[PDB]
Design a protein around this ligand. Structure first.
Ligand SMILES: [Ca+2]
Ligand SMILES: [Ca+2]
Lengths: 664, 661
């Protein structure tokens, strides 16, 4: 598994940016050109968000709005990022409440001219475009997953879905335990790198073991009971009062027992402001970088839109990666994960994989606590060079799962559902070939601050154009399929997935089959019974990595109900075997037409018309090998516009491939 | 001119090794024993590189570090090789930021016990010890120079001093010409020999013309737009997938017109992994070797320290030269240039000739873009046999200039400064006397890979010893001299060079005269004005091939104010005429003492003590003819501790000579 090449993992979680907000226009990721986008109940594509008075907001660039409103694109402000606001944007799974819940600024986005370091990093290393924040809400519950594998309950017994822990004087801290405490018990080295100001982002500080450590360490300081209280005083003190404060701290630190002292040194001692990267660089140069490093930048360095900016973040990212590259022998054995805690209130078009209501562990007030919106995740390391995309579903607990595989130290906090639906991040890596280490360009000057502002859409709206082209793609642990069978009052949808990992299916009803979209996780086989209440059915099933099955047609013994399409994927050949069946009394004529991945001067050789008589079946084999596994097929019956079957997907063979963007 | 005997030029450029890193111990080249080594501001020699807090790091052998750290000497890793890291190491021209910029591993070197084939080729053919990489940075800007004569600008208008072009799915490619496109239009034949994996070293692929041909030829491959994208899928594919992939490729290749098709075949079609020398040998055997061959090995064969090794490189170099030797008809009309793209971050002690700030075409962000660190260059041919050293200043564009002089196809991309300061590599050859193909030892077995590692300097440091002896040396197109006259508040330095090529002079200040070293290119005469603000001055001027002039003395009113030295070189006698004059009011006794090139038993007969009364002058004639034109003289005045004039160099006479050891 080649994980023995890793000696250091460095985790750098920035704040409050959604995937499309930054990378919707990036070549070769699931972005503004996504051909697996879901259609809203209004029939419009998810990108066309309902606004007030029957209007719509499309994604629009921050740069133009900044010019229009005469403001700086670096300093847009924050939007609602609350548990309730998220449920409103999410709208029961229909993903059409974004403008109402978040304002129209939710659709604003940056592109490569705006954030060139961000784009160059994705082009050089590996970017994850199915990486979700852990829960659709604010910072603290998301950071809980990264540090401990879950967000549990508040002391009042309610689910921890807000920032209540930030009242550090009155909150007693969370009691379900952190991963770093297990690393400590197992003898593995770790350290938090964090400055005097750290924007309540060092989540370990809110856990009960560490509150007890801080209180004892601070006992002599005149009343401070948690570190942020003490460091607020340090930040405001003159030189003389700082020396006094730090001398009183060190007297308290000397009273800690061996375990408390170690936890204090690794989680709670902050470095002077401005020196996070220099402190990290010093450990790199000394050969003392630990096995696991948490980098927790200050507010202004955090990328959070209320206190920071993209260029502030790019600046600290550069200094961290530069500090690493200054010592090649540490660089050759270090993986760096760069992600975001949540999406703020910024729109993203991918409906997240959610826990269905039967998964009570991951429901709160009738809403899923499981996988929020996509955020950018970049994996920077000697083993991820190449500009690859990795489309395996991950969340913040996937970082903990990486550490489980690497160190052997388990995190029992991760829920069974979450562990089933997310991966362990090992698929982003390729341990087999060395390359030269890329040089990363240093960011430009930080513009002078000229106030926060909120972008408003242009008067003339335009769909953004994603940078054209495909991207090399990592192999995925999925092999999904779905077939329909119309059966007396309902359609029986047979879901299958022969991959080594469970795959998430979502069903979107467009003929009143259900009131909201249905979600299911499948390893092996599973069955949806979709009740057809009228004369027709029309719904769409999505899955990972562009997988799509569309279903339309007539109901009981009513019209052309004889038509049956079955399918089987063959991984070794990357062939789709379509069994076309006639369950009726008339001699149907099927047509199979490519909708994509076939050069237009060529479709007729790949379009197939086949005649099937009553009680019989013909098999047509579609080869996707020329398209490296990608297929997009339309199956219809002549003289009938009710019946349709669309089949889109990528057949996996265990080897790297390309993304789906060479559709046209 | 003898260039008529050449029918084939073969260019094999390996990766990321500095000259001293490989040949600092080689007999008879400018290496670790270099008597013209520059002194650092600390007063230490350049080999003693400052580390932390008044400590330093001498060159140290990889082989010993490998015993200490229990690693394999073949598999040391790469160091920093960026434009800004190079600037820090070069340190404005003072050459004392190496350890800070690159880590102490920058001083690690190999010798004959470790890399015997490299040394044997130097002993057998011709080695160039003033061959520099074109620019002090990474691979791509240097390979730009070999393939195109320059590194121009990125699309954003910044100077292309980095590897931006390797982001091939986004970067649009470079817009100035390649030299190969000029050979093409001129009807000359050329071919690049490269495998499915070529480590982003086939520089022609990053020029817009070839990005366009690649995109067109890949149009039916289902998503690929640059060749490396397609071949990555080929390398991962089984035999059945491979046949489909090559079928998809050939469908697009069939759509190329006559000219695009020739470009594709000559620059873009890669051969199977492991068969580079085989496909080269096939062309040699069939009589179809082109006029110009670019050999671009795979990553594992490139010698690059992050993917390869010296023995991996020695293995492929030997196979290439063996293919040529197997066909004497082809060998006898073939010149092979073996060089390196850059020095990685490995130390080399020779400060490069750099463009001065006046030469704004070779400046970017206040740093010179012009001549990086020395790298090994070996010239293997019927006309370079005999173990010669050539010390004429060259860079990667000097290979292009050789092609100019041979094909008549000019490369206008080469800047005027580069044409002035570097030669055309004909000086490395002796076309009058072809000699028989010598045999060279085949490299041994490649050790199993045991991991990259970083050599650390030993606890007890030792300056390395260069192999003893001198080598035959090519005649050089320089004849430099420099002399000084003390004036009120300044020392005036008259530079001269009577050779047919411009000679590069550098001035190193050790008394505050300037904040950094100064650099001048001189054909004819030129003059420096060295400000003297204090009681004394001390500075050194270097020039090509061991040329040195040290000047030190009091500013005014000391025991030697009127001490003045002039010099005149005569090439026909290889004589140095020293004129010693007294422009003061006290009588002076000069001593002229050889510091080298005189038999220790004979030192006294060649030491001159001469009295020079005020307002008069006397002439000493130093005969360098028995030292093959080499001289190293110390001129002092009895009773003055400050005053010194050192004169060292080699008098050229148009004939092959010997090196300075
Ligand atoms: Ca946040
Ligand atoms: Ca290189």
């Amino acid at each position: 598994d080649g994980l023995g090449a890793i000696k250091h993992v460095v985790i750098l979680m920035q704040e409050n940016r959604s995937f499309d907000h930054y990378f919707g226009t990036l070549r070769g990721v699931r972005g503004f050109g996504d051909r697996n986008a879901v259609e809203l109940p209004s029939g419009k594509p998810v990108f066309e968000q309902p606004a007030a008075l029957g209007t719509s907001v499309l994604p629009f660039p921050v740069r133009d709005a900044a010019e229009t409103q005469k403001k700086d694109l670096q300093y847009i402000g924050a939007l609602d990022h609350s548990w309730s606001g998220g449920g409103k944007a999410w709208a029961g799974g229909w993903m059409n409440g974004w403008v109402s819940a978040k304002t129209a600024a939710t659709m604003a986005y940056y592109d490569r001219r705006d954030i060139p370091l961000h784009y160059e990093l994705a082009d050089t290393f590996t970017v994850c475009d199915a990486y979700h924040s852990s829960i659709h809400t604010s910072t603290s519950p998301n950071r809980n997953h990264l540090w401990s594998g879950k967000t549990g309950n508040e002391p009042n017994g309610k689910r921890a879905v807000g920032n209540d822990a930030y009242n550090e004087g009155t909150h007693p801290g969370y009691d379900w335990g952190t991963y770093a405490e297990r690393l400590e018990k197992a003898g593995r080295s770790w350290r938090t790198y964090t400055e005097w100001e750290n924007f309540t982002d060092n989540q370990i500080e809110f856990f009960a073991t560490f509150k007890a450590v801080a209180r004892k360490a601070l006992a002599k300081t005149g009343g401070h009971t948690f570190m942020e209280s003490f460091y607020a005083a340090v930040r405001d003190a003159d030189a003389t009062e700082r020396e006094r404060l730090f001398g009183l701290l060190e007297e308290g630190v000397a009273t800690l027992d061996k375990t408390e002292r170690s936890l204090f040194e690794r989680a709670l001692r902050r470095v002077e402001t401005g020196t996070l990267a220099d402190e990290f660089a010093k450990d790199v140069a000394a050969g003392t970088l630990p096995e696991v490093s948490y980098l927790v930048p200050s507010a202004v360095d955090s990328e959070h839109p209320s206190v920071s900016s993209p260029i502030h973040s790019a600046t600290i990212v550069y200094k961290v990666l530069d500090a690493l590259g200054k010592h090649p022998d540490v660089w050759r054995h270090t993986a760096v994960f760069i992600n975001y805690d949540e999406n703020d209130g910024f729109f993203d078009h991918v409906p997240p994989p959610v826990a269905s209501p039967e998964v009570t562990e991951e429901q709160w007030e009738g809403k899923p606590t499981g996988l929020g919106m996509r955020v950018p995740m970049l994996v920077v390391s000697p083993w991820t060079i190449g500009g690859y995309v990795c489309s395996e579903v991950f969340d913040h607990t996937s970082v903990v799962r990486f550490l489980e595989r690497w160190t052997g130290v388990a995190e029992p906090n991760i829920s069974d559902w979450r562990r089933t639906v997310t991966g362990d991040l090992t698929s982003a890596f390729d341990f087999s070939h060395a390359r030269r280490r890329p040089e990363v360009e240093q960011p430009g000057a930080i513009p002078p601050f000229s106030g926060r502002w909120s972008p408003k859409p242009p008067a003339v709206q335009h769909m953004p154009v994603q940078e054209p082209g495909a991207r090399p793609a990592r192999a995925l642990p999925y092999q999904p399929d779905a077939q329909a069978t119309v059966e007396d009052g309902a359609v029986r949808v047979d879901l299958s997935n022969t991959g080594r990992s469970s795959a998430h299916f979502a069903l979107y009803p467009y003929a009143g089959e259900f009131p909201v979209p249905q979600h299911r996780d499948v390893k092996g086989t599973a069955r949806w019974t979709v009740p057809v209440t009228g004369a027709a059915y029309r719904f769409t099933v999505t899955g990972p990595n562009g997988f799509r099955r569309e279903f339309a047609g007539p109901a009981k013994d009513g019209a052309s109900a004889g038509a049956e399409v079955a399918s089987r994927v063959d991984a070794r050949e990357r062939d789709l075997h379509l069994t076309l069946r006639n369950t009726g009394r008339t001699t149907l004529t099927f047509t199979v037409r490519p909708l994509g991945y076939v050069d237009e001067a060529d479709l007729r050789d790949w379009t197939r018309t086949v005649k099937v008589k009553p009680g019989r079946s013909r098999t047509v084999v579609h080869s996707a090998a020329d398209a490296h596994g990608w297929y997009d097929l339309d199956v219809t019956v002549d003289g009938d516009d009710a019946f349709r079957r669309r089949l889109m997907g990528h057949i996996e063979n265990g080897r790297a491939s390309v993304s789906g963007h060479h559709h046209h």
